[PDB]
């Protein structure tokens, strides 16, 4: 209950899941009927934008490093949104560390 949840992508309701077993970890979103499927490699993400907790809107956006690619998601429950955000924070942070080390060396 910390790697899956309901989310809305491009005005389409679906289930958002975090797949960490396969390296690199990628964010996969699937529609309820399975017609639409979206996959994003977390290694390409540069920053993680999230709406403030003081606003009724509950969007979470990931921006890819370079017309940079932008992925936006909307959730339903703040607890689900926060739980996904905390997990995503760990993945993005580690990949950023690897990028710094790779360029540093």
């Amino acid at each position: 209950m910390s790697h899956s949840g309901a989310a809305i992508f491009e005005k389409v309701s679906g289930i958002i899941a975090i797949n960490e077993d396969v390296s690199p970890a990628e964010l996969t979103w699937r529609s309820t009927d399975g017609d639409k499927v979206h996959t994003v490699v977390l290694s390409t993400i540069d920053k993680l934008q999230a709406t403030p907790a003081s606003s009724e809107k509950m969007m979470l956006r990931l921006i890819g490093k370079v017309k940079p690619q932008r992925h936006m998601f909307s959730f339903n429950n703040r607890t689900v949104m926060d739980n996904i955000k905390m997990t995503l924070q760990q993945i993005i942070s580690r990949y950023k560390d690897a990028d710094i080390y790779e360029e540093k060396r």
């Binding site: 209950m1 289930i15 993680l48 403030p52 932008r70 429950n77 942070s93």
Partner: protein
């Protein structure tokens, strides 16, 4: 999640499948497979008309196996309309189930006890039941037959004299049939369940449809003191690997810090030397290596969207 949640779900599934008809299973199963479910979505999931859905929801609501939640919604493109959501409040359903199971068992036990008492009497004409005590005082002068009051007619002995065993069989069957419910309740009592709410249920939501009109979000009105009945319920780690070059670099930084550290306590120059005589104040190896390598090689050879946002 938690093992208890499955136990509660299993108890609900058995109760609905046994003590209710067929369509009831479909409605409750859909609302158990998913979290809070909009009425419109529920209709199309089961493809049953609104009129048929009414009896199912109403009876389930009456037994408190399903809870209701109405909130005002403001679609960006259409006039506001009130939406109805259905979910399961486990404390409510378990509480209702526990009482009903006890009542049914108690009723049979009381009925079984009642059948063990004398039969009684009744009047065929006025269909008025008379107890043994009441019939004794209405007998005739000859004291041969009981007489009715309204009709003044002989009474007839009542039935149920042969049911002493039938009711015992009825109680025996129900206890054996209802075994899984008690076993589930026993495990439920051992654990502690948290009361569910419309917002809480949304955490486990599985969207029913692709473009459902109903917004499965709970945006409570800002700072509202109104209270409705039955609507309230009870850091990053980075690691840097230091090599030999970095180790000496850290030593140089530490040495610089030590040099600056003493300065804050170092005495000034005025303080050091007595200043009375001064003025006033104011106003090639590489080639040798290659031949060695060639020579040693010979030796080896020889030897071998603009919205407010924050950065998280």
């Amino acid at each position: 999640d938690r093992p208890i949640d499955d136990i509660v779900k299993n108890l609900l599934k058995f109760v609905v499948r046994g003590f209710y008809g067929g369509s009831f299973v479909l409605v409750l199963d859909a609302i158990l497979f998913h979290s809070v479910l909009a009425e419109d979505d529920l209709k199309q999931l089961l493809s049953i008309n609104k009129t048929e859905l009414g009896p199912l929801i109403a009876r389930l609501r009456s037994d408190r196996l399903i809870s209701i939640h109405k909130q005002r919604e403001y679609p960006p493109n259409s006039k506001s309309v009130e939406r109805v959501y259905y979910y399961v409040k486990y404390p409510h359903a378990i509480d209702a189930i526990k009482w009903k199971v006890h009542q049914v068992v108690q009723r049979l036990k009381d009925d079984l006890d009642k059948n063990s008492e004398p039969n009684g009497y009744m009047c065929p004409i006025c269909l008025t039941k008379y107890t043994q005590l009441e019939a004794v005082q209405l007998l005739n002068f000859d004291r041969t037959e009981f007489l009715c009051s309204l009709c003044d007619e002989p009474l007839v002995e009542d039935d149920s004299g042969k049911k002493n065993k039938e009711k015992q069989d009825k109680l025996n069957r129900l206890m054996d049939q209802i075994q899984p419910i008690i076993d589930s309740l026993k495990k439920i009592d051992d654990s502690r369940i948290e009361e569910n709410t419309f917002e809480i249920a949304l955490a486990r939501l599985i969207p029913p449809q692709n473009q459902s009109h109903a917004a499965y979000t709970y945006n409570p009105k800002k700072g509202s003191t109104m209270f409705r009945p039955g609507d309230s319920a009870p850091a990053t780690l980075h690691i840097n690997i230091t090599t030999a070059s970095d180790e000496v670099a850290q030593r140089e930084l530490q040495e610089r810090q030590a040099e600056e550290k003493r300065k804050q306590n170092a005495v000034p120059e005025w303080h050091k030397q007595s200043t009375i005589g001064k003025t006033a104040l104011g106003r090639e190896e590489r080639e040798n290596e290659k031949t060695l390598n060639d020579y040693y090689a010979a030796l080896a050879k020889k030897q071998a969207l603009e919205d407010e946002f924050e950065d998280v």
